[PDB]
Amino acid sequence: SMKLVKFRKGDSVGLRLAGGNDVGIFVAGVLEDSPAAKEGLEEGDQILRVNNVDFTNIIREEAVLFLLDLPKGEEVTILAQKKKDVYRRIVESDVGDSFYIRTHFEYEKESPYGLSFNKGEVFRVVDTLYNGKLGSWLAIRIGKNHKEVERGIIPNKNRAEQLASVQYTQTKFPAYERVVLREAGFLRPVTIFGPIADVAREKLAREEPDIYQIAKSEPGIIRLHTIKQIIDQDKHALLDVTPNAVDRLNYAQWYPIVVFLNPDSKQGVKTMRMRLCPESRKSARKLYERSHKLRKNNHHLFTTTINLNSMNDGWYGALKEAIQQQQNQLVWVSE
Amino acid sequence: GKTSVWI
Numbered sequence: 001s002m003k004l005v006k007f008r009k010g011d012s013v014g015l016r017l018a019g020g021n022d023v024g025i026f027v028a029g030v031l032e033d034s035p036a037a038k039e040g041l042e043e044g045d046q047i048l049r050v051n052n053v054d055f056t057n058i059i060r061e062e063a064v065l066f067l068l069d070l071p072k073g074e075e076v077t078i079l080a081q082k083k084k085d086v087y088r089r090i091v092e093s094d095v096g097d098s099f100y101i102r103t104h105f106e107y108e109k110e111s112p113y114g115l116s117f118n119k120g121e122v123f124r125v126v127d128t129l130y131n132g133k134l135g136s137w138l139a140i141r142i143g144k145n146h147k148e149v150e151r152g153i154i155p156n157k158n159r160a161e162q163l164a165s166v167q168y169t170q171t172k173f174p175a176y177e178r179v180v181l182r183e184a185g186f187l188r189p190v191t192i193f194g195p196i197a198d199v200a201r202e203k204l205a206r207e208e209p210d211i212y213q214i215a216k217s218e219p220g221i222i223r224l225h226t227i228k229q230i231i232d233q234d235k236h237a238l239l240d241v242t243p244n245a246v247d248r249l250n251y252a253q254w255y256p257i258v259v260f261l262n263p264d265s266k267q268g269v270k271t272m273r274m275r276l277c278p279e280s281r282k283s284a285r286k287l288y289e290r291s292h293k294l295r296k297n298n299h300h301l302f303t304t305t306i307n308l309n310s311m312n313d314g315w316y317g318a319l320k321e322a323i324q325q326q327q328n329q330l331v332w333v334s335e
Numbered sequence: 336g337k338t339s340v341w342i
Binding site: 012013014015016017028029031064067068129131132133134 | 337338339340341342
C-alpha cells in the first residue's frame, strides 16, 4: 500500500532515516508520541515525496538536511510506501548512498580514518551521513583500472567547497564533481608534454598520417573548430597547448588523452635532441626545467607517463601503444 | 551502535 500523510512539524518531524540515493530513503524509526506517527508513518516505509520535493533520488544527507530545514509549526505533506521486504535487504546488506565524484582540490586526511587526495581522483561515495555524523562522507578510492581500492572518510560537499575555496584564494570546477563511466564515441585529442613532445608529434603526424593529425596554431591560438574537424575525420588531434588549455578541454567534456614524456636527466635530453633533431636550437636545460615544473605542478592532468631512456627510442613504440591503450579505456565524465 | 540523527 501507498500512504499519504499531512502534519504540522513541531521542534522535529520525529524521524530517523536510512537508505540513500541508490535504494531510496527509508523510515528507520518513528517517535512514539509524534504527529507523523499518529498519521500512520512507520518503520520500513520508503519516503517517496516530501512536500513537493522528490525523495526517490536524493542523498541521505540532502534528505536529513531538507527535513531539518522545514519550518517549526508549518505543514508537511509526505507520500510514503510500505516496503518491509526492500527495507530488510537495505538494513542487512547495509547499503544506502552510491555515487561517484571527481575531486578538484588537494586534501590531506584530518584523522587516521581519512583519505587524502590530489586533484582529479575519483571516489565512490557510499554514505553521506557517515556514522550519523553530519560532515563525514564514507568513500572508496577508485583506481586506474576502475576497480575499488581502499575506503575511508572524506569531507562532505559543503566542507569540501569551503576547503577548496580557502585553497584558491580559471577553472570553474566544483570541489566535488559528479561523474559516471562512459565510452568514447570519438577519437579523443592527444596532448604530449615533455622535452621531446615536439619531436613526438612530428613523428606521429609523419609515420601515421591516417590515425593522427596536427591542429594548426593560427595567428598563437589553437581553436576548437580545428580540433572538431580532425575528430570528424576519425583521427586524434595532436595539440601543442598549455596545461590550462587541457584543464579547459576536460571541463568542456573533450577529455584529451594526455601523455607526459618523463626525461631521465638534463644531459639525457641533450643527447636525445642531438639524435632526434640536431636541427633544433632549443635549450635542453630549459626544456628539462619546464618538464620538471610541469610534472611538479600539473601531474593531476596526465593520463599516462612514459619514462624516457636517453639512449633508446623505444618511447615511440611505447607512445603509440599507450595512446591507443587509453582510447580503449572508459572515461569518467560529468553528469 | 552508531549515533543516530533524529530530525
